[PDB]
Design a protein around this nucleic acid. Structure first.
Lengths: 89, 81, 83
RNA sequence: UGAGAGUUUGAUCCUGGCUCAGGACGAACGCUGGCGGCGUGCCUAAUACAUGCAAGUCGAACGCUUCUUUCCUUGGAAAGAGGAGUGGCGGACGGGUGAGUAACACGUGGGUAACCUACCCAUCAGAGGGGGAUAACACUUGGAAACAGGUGCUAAUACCGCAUAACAGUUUAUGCCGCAUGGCAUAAGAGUGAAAGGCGCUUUCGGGUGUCGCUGAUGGAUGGACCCGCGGUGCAUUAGCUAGUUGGUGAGGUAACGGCUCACCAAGGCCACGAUGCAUAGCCGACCUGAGAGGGUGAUCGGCCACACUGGGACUGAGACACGGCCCAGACUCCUACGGGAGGCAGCAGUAGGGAAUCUUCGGCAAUGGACGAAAGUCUGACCGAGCAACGCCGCGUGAGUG
RNA sequence: AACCAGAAAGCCACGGCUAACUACGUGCCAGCAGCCGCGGUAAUACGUAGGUGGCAAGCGUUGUCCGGAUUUAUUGGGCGUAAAGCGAGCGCAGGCGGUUUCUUAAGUCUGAUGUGAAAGCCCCCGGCUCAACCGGGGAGGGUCAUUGGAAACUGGGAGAC
């Protein structure tokens, strides 16, 4: 059940999120595989940097992103290019 | 304490009963084959085919998982001829 | 094939057992605190194929797979024969 | 990037011990006591625990039953809500503690022509047709209780048999290749399943069809297992230890090689480069200190390993020899009609005790992450925040001009 | 945006080592002290008072670890008289070895590949009004494994003096 999701690094009141693929058995900030991109919640509009090249060949291997990951990957056409590459091809 | 896992105990007891029955059926099949070949009387092929089909059903219906079934078909084929 | 085993080169102590010899490898290591070239040895246990090995003779060996109760190597070639 | 002083003598110079100036603390005690931000808080008895909460969920698998409603009002459809039970999935994750352990337990580099893998993606092939039960239910039996039976009826994606499926495994032959045993490709010789299911749809007899499920094989992915070189601790006023030990043959067994276990044969194996024994300790990322080589330590936080009152055992399951699962023995606590039963805070708060000494029996799923479910949702002492403590670190105050 | 200098400072030392001295009382009693050593009537060493000196919402005491400690000395000590060459000899094992030619390449050096999880230390930048803190971007740490080179030294093999 490989799965990409969030992981936070903030202090007490102001979080800061990194997107990182972890196995689902692991804890919230436990071990993982590799960090791919991060997520700043604060300072709206939301500020996201992604490597976005491992992600295509790392979803084609098959992993299920969570819901906040789904919104912030829909905001860059990630799933767009995913089904444009898989179904459409 | 016991909370809601008492549902699993009944399931495991029923699985014990029927798994014991089916595996003892397989063991008496193979035992009958061995006692048949060791005397070497007539009617040697039918109980051989029965033992093969019994190992197959024990692999498929219940569980061994795959591999003791393969090893038993090998060591039972070498015992046949 | 990606990589062979780590083959070792040594010599023989005993050969009394059937298909089985006793191989010594030996090299140098520095001391942790000080620095001279002290040397030491390890004894391994290979497996001869037809008991044709020699008492005290140069040979080389290869990692194989766990074949018996703590012996693991196999004979490859007598590198140098001694009288 | 390296700062020396006192102290033996009536006075001197050497060699030499002892004390002082530096910094750190999960620290405590004394005196004194404003606030704000960020962290930290049983090291001692792995001592005994009252109380409250810490894992459940799916009606779109299956019947049953209760209540509230316009439904032909004596009955009625449908809807809403409640309850118990068969069935699937998760309770092996997430949290806690270092008691054991001097070893492939850890760290690092390797290996599998000795290996397995539920959930998630990819591909090919199927999804034919039968059969018998049973919980609930209704009635009764024995019991202080814990609950155990009996008779009769009922359903399924529960169960069982028939058929069909080599694409799996074996052997033969051909070719290609390899680290002996061997691996790969092709053509032939013997035996295996299904939910046949659900939600809906265009849908005229019709029965074609979408989605979520079911079954066989092969790959990707994550996760688990085994084997090897190297390195990390004192004692010689601890020098011999070992019979399934060492090797072979065959058989059994394991996912998987193997004395893993048996039967037979031969007596081998390890040690002064420290075997064996004895004592102490979980191991690393790291932390303090130092010019550096080093020396000391392993609390937070990240990884691995081990343990769940003590000691044995297996079953279900893809996955435990199982942290709020079962059985047995033992110590301890409780109930009893004496016949017999119930139990395990090293989960969160708290209690009692030990101590020089370490917190509130708090609020909430809004965020992130799990589990179930098509979705809404339900659970979540994980977590998010609040409260206590000059414990550490940081910042700003207890006016100021003239006088 | 209004009111208020108003409610807001204690702790240790003062003989040398080590910045800071004077009165009164005690009288080798009482007491003090890290070490030296101070008190039998005149004590900067005891008790108080004044002043001073060092810190500051902290100051002191206790306990532990590292430095100073070249006091385990590889860097970095020695052995005539101060601790310290066995009473002397023969020898297994072990350590260290004359000169040269050729060869190997284990040690030694060097290049490339993979690896040293994340957070910590360090360097640059960004954000809380700075700081503490947080975030982004880099290097470090093996006696590490594979592969390609070098041949002065050491080792291994062949000769020669």
């Amino acid at each position: 059940a490989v799965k990409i999701r969030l992981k936070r690094m903030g202090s007490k009141k102001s979080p800061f999120y990194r997107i990182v693929v972890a196995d689902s058995r692991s804890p919230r900030d436990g071990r993982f595989i590799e960090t791919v991109g991060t997520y700043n919640p604060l300072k709206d509009p939301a500020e996201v940097v992604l490597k976005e090249d491992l992600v295509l060949d790392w979803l084609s291997k098959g992993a299920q992103p969570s819901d906040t990951v789904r919104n912030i990957l829909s905001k860059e056409g990630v799933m767009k290019k995913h089904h444009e590459a898989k179904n459409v091809k | 304490n016991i909370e809601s896992a008492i549902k699993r105990v009944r399931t495991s007891a029923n699985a014990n009963a029927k798994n014991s029955s089916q595996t003892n059926a397989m063991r008496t099949a193979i035992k009958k084959f061995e006692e048949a070949v060791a005397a070497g009387a007539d009617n040697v092929d039918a109980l051989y085919n029965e033992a093969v089909k019994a190992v197959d059903m024990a692999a498929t219906k219940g569980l061994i998982h795959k591999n003791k079934a393969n090893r038993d078909k090998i060591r039972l084929s070498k015992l046949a001829k | 094939e990606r990589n062979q085993r780590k083959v070792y080169q040594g010599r023989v102590v005993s050969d009394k057992m059937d298909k089985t010899i006793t191989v010594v490898v030996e090299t140098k290591k520095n001391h942790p605190i000080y620095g001279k070239r002290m040397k030491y040895s390890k004894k391994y246990k290979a497996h001869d194929e037809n008991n044709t090995a020699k008492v005290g003779d140069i040979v080389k060996i290869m990692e194989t797979r766990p074949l018996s109760a703590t012996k693991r190597f196999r004979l490859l070639e007598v590198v140098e024969e001694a009288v």
